[PDB]
Amino acid sequence: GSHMSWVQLAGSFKAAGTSGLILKRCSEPERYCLARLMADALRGCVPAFHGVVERDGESYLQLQDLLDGFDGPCVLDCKMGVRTYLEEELTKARERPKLRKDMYKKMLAVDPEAPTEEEHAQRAVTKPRYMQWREGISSSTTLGFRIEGIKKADGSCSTDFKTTRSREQVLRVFEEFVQGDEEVLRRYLNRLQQIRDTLEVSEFFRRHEVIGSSLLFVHDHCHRAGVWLIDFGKTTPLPDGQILDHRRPWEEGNREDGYLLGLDNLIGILASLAER
Ligand SMILES: Nc1ncnc2c1ncn2[C@@H]1O[C@H](COP(=O)(O)OP(=O)(O)OP(=O)(O)O)[C@@H](O)[C@H]1O
Ligand SMILES: O=P(O)(O)O[C@@H]1[C@H](O)[C@@H](O)[C@@H](OP(=O)(O)O)[C@H](OP(=O)(O)O)[C@H]1O
Ligand SMILES: [Mn+2]
Numbered sequence: 001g002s003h004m005s006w007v008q009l010a011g012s013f014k015a016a017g018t019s020g021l022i023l024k025r026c027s028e029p030e031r032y033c034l035a036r037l038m039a040d041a042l043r044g045c046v047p048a049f050h051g052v053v054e055r056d057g058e059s060y061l062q063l064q065d066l067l068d069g070f071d072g073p074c075v076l077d078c079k080m081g082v083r084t085y086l087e088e089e090l091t092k093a094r095e096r097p098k099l100r101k102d103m104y105k106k107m108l109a110v111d112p113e114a115p116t117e118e119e120h121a122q123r124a125v126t127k128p129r130y131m132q133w134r135e136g137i138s139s140s141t142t143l144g145f146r147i148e149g150i151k152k153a154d155g156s157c158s159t160d161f162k163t164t165r166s167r168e169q170v171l172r173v174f175e176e177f178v179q180g181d182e183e184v185l186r187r188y189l190n191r192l193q194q195i196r197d198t199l200e201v202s203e204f205f206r207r208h209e210v211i212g213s214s215l216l217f218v219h220d221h222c223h224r225a226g227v228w229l230i231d232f233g234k235t236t237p238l239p240d241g242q243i244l245d246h247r248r249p250w251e252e253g254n255r256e257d258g259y260l261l262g263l264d265n266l267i268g269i270l271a272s273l274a275e276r
Helices: 001-009 028-037 040-044 088-096 101-110 115-121 127-137 168-177 182-201 259-275
Strands: 012-015 021-025 050-055 059-064 074-080 145-152 208-209 215-218 225-231 234-237
Touching: 012 050, 021 168, 021 259, 028 050, 028 059, 028 168, 028 234, 040 182, 074 259, 088 127, 101 115, 127 182, 145 168, 145 259, 168 182, 168 259, 182 215, 182 259
Parallel strands: none
Antiparallel strands: 012 021, 021 059, 050 059, 074 145, 074 215, 208 234, 215 225
């Protein structure tokens, strides 16, 4: 039905006036991206963007609610890329680090030996360091994506995936998510194949570094299934008509995100699951 229904039953999102719409807090990178995307090959692969509206003296993107077509939708959010932070974050952590004490606590929680003697003494870490560690204990570094969360229309949710890393561990999460619905799985794979084809010819995609974006998988008990790209908050245009291949390894300076390495691996896992 609607994402705000799930928010209620379960805060960067707000109920929209119009049926089948949702409001997301406006950010300049994301607004720029969605405007370009409505004119791009990737138009059909992203939520419809209708413009910006003011609500309580605040800027919101008016988006298609992707859950609107579904009867009690199941949702899985997959963070795409081998890298999950911008290169400019490495620069700022070198010249002027913002010691994040929150990121220290989670890291200790998951691995006590993970922080350095100095990080322990600071009780704090830089964002890039926290983000790189998260990439290595999840599937991000090796497969180029990670499962972030599953939501169900009752209000039910799990984000308990920070150590889901192996190909088989990831397959077992998708196995449990689709619950033996062969039609949903087939529809997911058909949609991902058609998304890969669109990305490989997209003018937007070859000209932009896509960091921190997700693939949202949505299905219901009527076997309806959809996948969309979301979250263009960290998607930045390359300078002077430079382009990325989105498969080759990331080395500081080359701005590569491994986005299609992730999608290739994600398609392979779903095709493997379909043959079980
Ligand atoms: N257009 C949409 N329609 C329906 N649900 C959506 C839509 N966009 C986002 N969502 C829901 O909101 C969640 C968060 O989306 P998104 O990543 O864009 O926001 P964010 O505030 O940047 O979050 P994060 O910091 O986790 O990346 C999605 O995983 C999904 O459950
Ligand atoms: O999921 P987590 O392990 O909790 O980490 C969070 C997650 O990677 C994203 O939500 C990041 O936002 P993004 O950099 O805009 O994508 C958060 O970044 P901050 O807003 O905290 O700086 C980070 O905290
Ligand atoms: Mn985000």
